[PDB]
Design an enzyme around this catalytic site. Structure first.
Site: not given
Ligand SMILES: NC(=O)c1ccc[n+]([C@@H]2O[C@H](COP(=O)([O-])OP(=O)(O)OC[C@H]3O[C@@H](n4cnc5c(N)ncnc54)[C@H](O)[C@@H]3O)[C@@H](O)[C@H]2O)c1
Ligand SMILES: Nc1cccc([C@@]2(c3ccsc3)CC(O)=C(Sc3ccccc3Cl)C(=O)O2)c1
Ligand SMILES: NC(=O)c1ccc[n+]([C@@H]2O[C@H](COP(=O)([O-])OP(=O)(O)OC[C@H]3O[C@@H](n4cnc5c(N)ncnc54)[C@H](O)[C@@H]3O)[C@@H](O)[C@H]2O)c1
Ligand SMILES: NC(=O)c1ccc[n+]([C@@H]2O[C@H](COP(=O)([O-])OP(=O)(O)OC[C@H]3O[C@@H](n4cnc5c(N)ncnc54)[C@H](O)[C@@H]3O)[C@@H](O)[C@H]2O)c1
Ligand SMILES: NC(=O)c1ccc[n+]([C@@H]2O[C@H](COP(=O)([O-])OP(=O)(O)OC[C@H]3O[C@@H](n4cnc5c(N)ncnc54)[C@H](O)[C@@H]3O)[C@@H](O)[C@H]2O)c1
Ligand SMILES: Nc1cccc([C@@]2(c3ccsc3)CC(O)=C(Sc3ccccc3Cl)C(=O)O2)c1
Ligand SMILES: Nc1cccc([C@@]2(c3ccsc3)CC(O)=C(Sc3ccccc3Cl)C(=O)O2)c1
Ligand SMILES: Nc1cccc([C@@]2(c3ccsc3)CC(O)=C(Sc3ccccc3Cl)C(=O)O2)c1
Lengths: 322, 325, 325, 328
Positions: C99, C159, C162, C186
């Site tokens: 991690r 969060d 949901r 988060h």
């Molecule tokens: N904060 C939230 O509530 C939440 C919810 C869902 C997902 N996420 C997050 O969103 C992120 C992305 O999810 P995902 O499923 O689209 O991942 P993904 O790997 O499918 O997409 C990521 C993209 O970033 C690009 N990338 C990597 N390095 C780069 C750089 N230096 N410059 C520009 N682009 C670059 C990759 O090429 C890729 O296309 C994850 O970190 C995930 O945890 C957050």
């Molecule tokens: N596209 C993509 C790819 C990998 C991980 C994720 C993730 C994920 C991460 C750990 S479990 C699910 C990234 C992410 O932060 C969320 S929200 C969320 C995650 C854990 C607990 C409660 C909430 Cl509300 C979420 O829903 O999705 C999304």
């Protein structure tokens, strides 16, 4: 062959019925603001307009039709006859002529005609006095309580949230507060429920809504009542705010959203009220109209004000001759 | 501390300029219909209203503000003073009042409005709705000193919208799929361009060569006659028109505010086209965006259509050359 | 001459710049769901896409452009070079991957991204979506040198959305009318604020004192447990999450682009609150507008809730102090 | 009493049959892009999703439901069983099936439709069917044959996307929004589509009248490349990201809007063309159709040149050649 027949080949001419029809009764400033707001929100596939003033009605219909290119409601109709209102999902009554008696007489003609052509519609009453006239529409129509909705405290609450938003520097959408009971002068601001992000204003400021309040938040509710009379004094009527608030109720109903709105419903069985009276409480609005209502915990004073409104409304309503 | 300070912690007091501001001058039926249509289309982050009738202006502003919960325009302002209009991207003019006398009365109104608009929003686009729209767009252009791209007349936008509505009703097709252009001088003297009337790129004139002539058995000329007839009919029936013009103006505002580059029939400087040599504004299809009219479509007109635009230009210039600025 | 010149007469060849540009960095499932939601909400006049995978980036841009007829965003651009992102009002970062080894890899990505974003849009608002969002919002803030108001983390926005969905399902009420805030860190360590949970201003905690405790016969604590469980369940079932995050990000983008001043649970610099002394980002209700986070709501938390946020801030700082910039 | 009962007083528990319901069959990239576009356009009061891959289907449904706060479609449902699709007004089929025979891939998709279509018909006998799955012209015919529905209720996505891409490309060349660039791509969807040069216009001004070489090989400006790029663009997106989704989803939602809102707008969609352009076979080809609550109520009779007519006839002969050999 005609130019139309040269250009277009018809597959079928089969008879069809509107699927999301809305009728607006009374084409005054209120009715027309309801109409334009409903049209710009794409809530209906057909809009029908009804009034007794035939020239104004035709002119209003034509004016809306001329803007068809900019809308997504393909059919706009009007007429003095209620056959134009057939199969409406929602019928909005904005028609209006002491004042109680002449508006009750207008409803005696309107409501049976509405029921005849749209027996399964939801009725949305805007005409004043809205709480008495929602009861009058319910009594005349014979509809179940869920399908008779009064605009009630929807506008009062919207104005309250606007004023709250102005004081806090926050959008009204994020300023929560409920104005309930009898629409207008006798409405009740529920101080306990006023909040931003679930943070109770009353818990932070215990003097909120009292005479001991140095910030005089009681003035926010006083200004809801004062603002309404001020708009009348300044432009002669109100239209835009009511039209927008009615279209918001129409959206919940047409889209079966089950959002909670402060509207007038049959309150018998609550707050010691034993009479057939309609007062505003938060109601869940959907495709069946009012399916449910929220049971708000009120203080002794708030409960007394609703009971006094119920006693006054029933006093007028028991003397009504249908 | 105050309840506001107990509830909210402020990170910055820095209040910037409104970024997508629209002003409506004149709060009559036309201006208010423009206002509500603009509000329901989320085109502005700030709406300013101006009029000389102070009570009505305040009442209209307050009525719109009371519907804020249902809108996404966070600031609605009004005033007789043009300081409320500062930094507007678009300024819509609906203010106004013998014929040469009536036009002169509107020139005197514009003599007060336009310098005040220019003072507080020197980089705005001006959208003229006030009648006679072709003359008043020229007047706004002359007084403002703005380049021609930033002075737009509502022109034949409404005429075309009504034409498409009527065409749609005859064909049983939505007006969005019924294409047809009404150009030239707004109102009684407008020109229906029969050659461009089509559904799905299928020319109605090619299918029906008599289209728009007196020898037409179906009398499609009546569709353009009904555009002019309808307008007088709405006035006779309700005393004014508001909803259709408001919706059509908001459609123009959308292309301008969102830099869409959609084509609209609006009034522009036509000098150099159709043998027109005078400083006159007539409707042609224009490309609308962030800098107003950036381009215009050069419509192929028949000799008769070209002659009608030239006659309108001559009549417009005849009135214009006699106006006192 | 050309067909274009025969058809269109040009009034001015003025070089123009977008007024409402948004950039999305990272075109994965999250980034693309953000882009489609922003496009369907008409929030931008220009959309820029950036990624390191050049073929996927071009394909995604072209796919969006092919739907232009159905949108009101006239320019969609993409590139590996950040010159395509110049003069963006809002820049959304969805780019990313033990991690701790993971965090440092995202820090390495941000060391390249953030200076490039700042170079071309020095006055933009940064919206961080990439995980661990609270740490990466701090990282973006540290690298950019931006004031705290212009660095926003998606934080507990999803969060809370949901939570409101689950609350709505239990009560038979639309999530829009079910109010409840999930704050702090988060993900797994988020805090459901039981005291603020209400429908129509009616406190659920006042009506049901056992709400959010182990004594609760209805087990409302499971609603927050399901917010965490749901996220892992969606990953298990379809391999990733996209639609809910995209919609939630577009809701934040709307408040920022339209200067709405609506309140959202997003990640902000919390130093100075709840006894927190470290440079850490945690979710609290923030007022969002044209300057990003202008204000925050000071939520009254119980001693237990306050302790959980303090423990999260200690844990985040523990990871942060070991990061190499 | 429960917290729900303490908070809320119920007036009636009765639930109405779905009023404005849409079903999407197949939750791949195409189906899901159709689903998000329909959701963001507020076209349905209920959305049903169906697929054979149960875990992906549940995950997609849950992901959409988690965004409910930001939508105005209050009920999103899914299942392998077609009882979840009951009373849909519109059913969108995107479900589909390494160099195999032309007739082989078609028969694989026909086998899928033999299972889908009777199940759709069982639960929504009065729905409009909108076919997106490829080869769209043949599969619309297959859906029409299996369903037994009248021709007005069986619509193929057809040349809707081809025309949208054409207008985008036209818009780019002219510096005008695609909404103001009119042009129709008709006939067989895909490689063999027909650009109708005579109808290409801006503000009713014919491009062909201004430029007679328009759409010919002698054209110095090579406007034929605009149609060639419609076909080339599609293969380029596949090469670059592996599939296409956003453009098709948006185009399908535009068709769904005209049907759900009874707009009677004209769209280039695939319809049963027997009786036009010398076509005597039961084949579906794209022509401009008026779309509304009864599906295709009318069609526009486009005047085609001899060459355009010949191309549609050749497409009709090829499509019928495949269809007459299909095992039902
Ligand atoms: N904060 C939230 O509530 C939440 C919810 C869902 C997902 N996420 C997050 O969103 C992120 C992305 O999810 P995902 O499923 O689209 O991942 P993904 O790997 O499918 O997409 C990521 C993209 O970033 C690009 N990338 C990597 N390095 C780069 C750089 N230096 N410059 C520009 N682009 C670059 C990759 O090429 C890729 O296309 C994850 O970190 C995930 O945890 C957050
Ligand atoms: N596209 C993509 C790819 C990998 C991980 C994720 C993730 C994920 C991460 C750990 S479990 C699910 C990234 C992410 O932060 C969320 S929200 C969320 C995650 C854990 C607990 C409660 C909430 Cl509300 C979420 O829903 O999705 C999304
Ligand atoms: N409940 C609220 O929050 C709220 C807010 C604003 C206004 N109002 C009310 O809305 C009502 C209308 O306001 P207005 O300004 O439009 O009044 P108005 O007088 O201008 O319009 C009323 C219309 O009803 C028509 N009408 C009268 N009798 C009729 C009949 N038998 N059938 C059909 N139509 C008939 C009239 O001809 C007239 O056009 C008033 O009662 C007013 O108090 C309510
Ligand atoms: N071009 C079109 O297609 C089209 C269509 C419909 C209406 N119109 C025109 O729009 C105009 C307005 O219509 P209306 O019904 O709203 O008229 P109106 O008289 O009801 O409203 C005009 C407003 O302008 C205000 N005004 C007058 N002088 C002013 C000044 N010096 N500064 C600011 N405000 C001032 C008036 O006080 C009044 O409120 C008319 O000229 C009409 O012909 C044009
Ligand atoms: N007509 C057009 O303009 C156009 C444009 C783009 C894509 N397409 C087509 O759309 C189709 C789908 O594209 P895709 O990328 O989503 O494919 P995909 O393989 O990713 O998705 C197809 C889905 O259908 C499902 N499916 C298979 N058999 C099923 C059954 N018996 N019942 C229910 N579901 C079943 C699969 O499980 C899969 O999830 C393709 O045929 C493609 O060619 C058409
Ligand atoms: N068009 C029109 C014509 C007559 C009266 C009205 C009225 C009016 C009545 C008395 S003061 C204003 C009708 C009406 O009920 C309202 S809301 C309202 C009224 C009084 C107090 C508090 C509130 Cl929220 C309101 O705002 O407007 C509107
Ligand atoms: N609100 C208001 C007040 C006075 C005059 C008007 C007017 C009006 C003038 C004469 S008949 C109608 C102003 C006006 O130009 C129009 S459009 C129009 C007018 C005449 C012919 C063809 C068209 Cl498209 C129109 O529709 O409305 C509106
Ligand atoms: N999701 C997915 C999966 C495989 C193939 C496809 C396809 C594809 C087929 C051949 S090249 C691209 C399916 C498909 O019909 C289209 S439209 C199209 C295809 C070829 C030429 C012209 C046009 Cl307008 C299209 O754009 O995409 C999509």
């Amino acid at each position: 062959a005609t130019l139309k027949d040269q250009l277009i080949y018809n597959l079928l001419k089969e008879e069809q019925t509107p699927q999301n029809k809305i009728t607006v009764v009374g084409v005054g400033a209120v009715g027309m603001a309801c109409a334009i707001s409903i049209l710009m929100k794409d809530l209906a596939d057909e809009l029908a307009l009804v009034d007794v003033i035939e020239d104004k009605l035709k002119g209003e219909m034509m004016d809306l039709q001329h803007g068809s290119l900019f809308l997504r409601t393909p059919k706009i109709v009007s007429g003095k006859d209620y056959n134009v209102t057939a199969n409406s999902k929602l019928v909005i009554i904005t028609a209006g002529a002491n004042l109680v008696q002449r508006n009750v007489n207008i409803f005696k003609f309107i409501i049976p005609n509405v029921v005849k052509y749209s027996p399964n519609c939801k009725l949305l009453i805007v005409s004043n006095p809205v709480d008495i006239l929602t009861y009058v529409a319910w009594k005349i129509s014979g509809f179940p309580k869920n399908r008779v909705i009064g605009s009630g405290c929807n506008l009062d609450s919207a104005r309250f949230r606007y004023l709250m938003g102005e004081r806090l520097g926050v959008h009204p959408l994020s300023c929560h507060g409920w104005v309930l009971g009898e629409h207008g002068d006798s409405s009740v601001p529920v101080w306990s429920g006023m909040n931003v992000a679930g943070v109770s204003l009353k818990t932070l400021h215990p003097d909120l809504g009292t005479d001991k309040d140095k910030e005089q938040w009681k003035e926010v509710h006083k200004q809801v009542v004062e603002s309404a009379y001020e708009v009348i004094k300044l432009k002669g009527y109100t239209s835009w705010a009511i039209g927008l608030s009615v279209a918001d109720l129409a959206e919940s109903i047409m889209k079966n959203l089950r959002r909670v709105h402060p509207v007038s419903t049959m309150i018998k069985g609550l707050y010691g009220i034993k009479d057939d009276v309609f007062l505003s409480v938060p109601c869940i609005l959907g495709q069946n109209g009012i399916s449910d209502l929220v049971k708000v915990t009120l203080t002794s004073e708030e409960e007394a004000r609703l009971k006094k409104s119920a006693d006054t409304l029933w006093g007028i309503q028991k003397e009504l001759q249908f």
